[PDB]
A paper describes a structure:
To gain insight into the molecular mechanisms by which C. difficile spores sense germinant, we solved the crystal structure of C. difficile CspC to 1.55 Å resolution. Furthermore, diffraction quality crystals were only obtained with wild-type CspC in the absence of bile acids. Despite this shared secondary structure, C. difficile CspC does not autoprocess its prodomain due to substitutions in its catalytic triad. Interestingly, the degenerate site residues of CspC’s pseudotriad share the same orientation as the catalytic triad of CspB and other subtilisin-like serine proteases. When the interfaces between each of the three subdomains were evaluated by buried surface area analysis, a larger contact area is observed between each of the domains in CspC as compared to CspB (3200 Å2 for CspC vs. 2270 Å2 for CspB, calculated with PDBe PISA). Surprisingly, even with the extensive interactions between the different sub-domains of CspC, residues in both the jelly roll domain and prodomain have higher B-factors than nearby residues in the subtilase domain. Two additional residues exhibited considerable conformational flexibility in the CspC structure: arginine 456 and glycine 457, which lacked sufficient electron density to be included in our model for CspC.
The major nosocomial pathogen Clostridioides difficile depends on spore germination to initiate infection. Interestingly, C. difficile’s germinant sensing mechanism differs markedly from other spore-forming bacteria, since it uses bile acids to induce germination and lacks the transmembrane germinant receptors conserved in almost all spore-forming organisms. Instead, C. difficile is thought to use CspC, a soluble pseudoprotease, to sense these unique bile acid germinants.
Numbering used by the authors: 2 to 88, 93 to 455, 458 to 505, 509 to 555, 560 to 565
The structure:
Amino acid sequence: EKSYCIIYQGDIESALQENGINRYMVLNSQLAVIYVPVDFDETILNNIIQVAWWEESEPMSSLIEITNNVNNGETITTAAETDYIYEDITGRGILLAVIDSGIDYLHPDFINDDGTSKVLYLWDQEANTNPPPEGFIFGSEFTRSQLNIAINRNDGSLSQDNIGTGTLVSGILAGNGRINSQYRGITTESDLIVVKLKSYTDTYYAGRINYSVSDFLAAITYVTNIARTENKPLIINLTIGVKSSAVATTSILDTFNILSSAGVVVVSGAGNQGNTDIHYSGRFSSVGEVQDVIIQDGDDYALDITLNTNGPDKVGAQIISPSGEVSHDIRYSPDFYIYRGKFNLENTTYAMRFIYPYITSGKENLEIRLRDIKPGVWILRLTSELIISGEYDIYLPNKNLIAPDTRFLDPDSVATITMYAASDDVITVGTFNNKTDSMWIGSSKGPIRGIKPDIVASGVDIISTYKNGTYNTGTGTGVSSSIVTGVLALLMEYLEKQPRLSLFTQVLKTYLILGATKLEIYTYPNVSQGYGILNLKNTIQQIANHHHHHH
């Protein structure tokens, strides 16, 4: 099953059904997702008048690395600096969304003294034992009442977290320290809304697991539906991400009107591509110039390469195999042609085509798909056709989806933000390393053209709940974003106590930036640290007491 995101106008449901597209979900007034067989002819979508835009759903991967280092780890209390509060603010009345690998809801650290679950709602997109949530076409929805019975019966079968990152995230936000009190999370009275996303294996490299944009967008619809029903503020914590990009405009998440409402806040990790060499930056100085971009491939099965030209610049492209066989030398043409072929010695096939993603507003990007790729040096030969600045960017998939040795020969760590964290409509969090008193080497960096991340937070070897009633440690920007999510829940309750219609992302981001710690002699803001390090105590003092970072 592949899937597509669709921007529609009119009666899209009738139109899809008339075209034999029977598996779909309408997610908001503009956005639908469809699920179709592998043999599906995507050109169909151009001849459905109710379709305005369409894009194949791309892989997403975790922003957390599990590091098995509890003995030298840092507690959540230390990372979030929450002794200043707890040593009447608990996160009461705030909903927190975890969209990830699920949750081990039988972990004692998610069970209250009276035996009830800290999870309010759980949608397991893979399960088939309860009906899906209303308006969705797969998985099983569970409520706290059901989880409470499951806890009483020690029934862990409703939904399992087989990876552990969702459990790690949930513990940062809300673990109660039942097994080890030192390891408790940030909030005590916030409710969790958990979605376990459908998973896929071996997309590029054997043994690696990814998620898919379409399923993620459906999860966004579900958790915001719940927030609307419960009429409570909601923080959505993005601990997974698509591939990195240099674009800084809004994403397809901007189709959700609810994400522009008061009391609905999106926090994302910045990305974990700061040192993974999955980004190439280049610049043409003239038209007709040829530049060769060197890619080393490890033992990948497949690879997707995205080229973006950041402006009106037009660039042609050709793929060259380690043995010297070449692909079509493609140029801009006003058609949807997919150029295909085979590198005979390598037995590798390619598909190259221009893509029109929603985020670039009609500007084409170049997509190159290599299948059955073999190890060695691959060359992307680029020819400029029209330039103003001449600048361009190329991205490989996130490193945790591809072979360890797959990389650009000449990488650029700048402009490695994961794409959904690029927009100013999200609070974007990078990872500080308290052990080295510096940024984590893996933390993605903002672009120079255009500031991300907004702030950073401790996120190296953080101890949290893990599967099967254990503790483990995690590192990365999904850890840091979880720290900020939990602290923001405390800040939102503090603001409400001493109007909720004013708790917009922009307001909360301003307070986080005003309270952030700036280390001596560095220049701020910068594309590594943003405006500085999260500081709960100083942010409260700012809330209590021209000061805007753009004024």
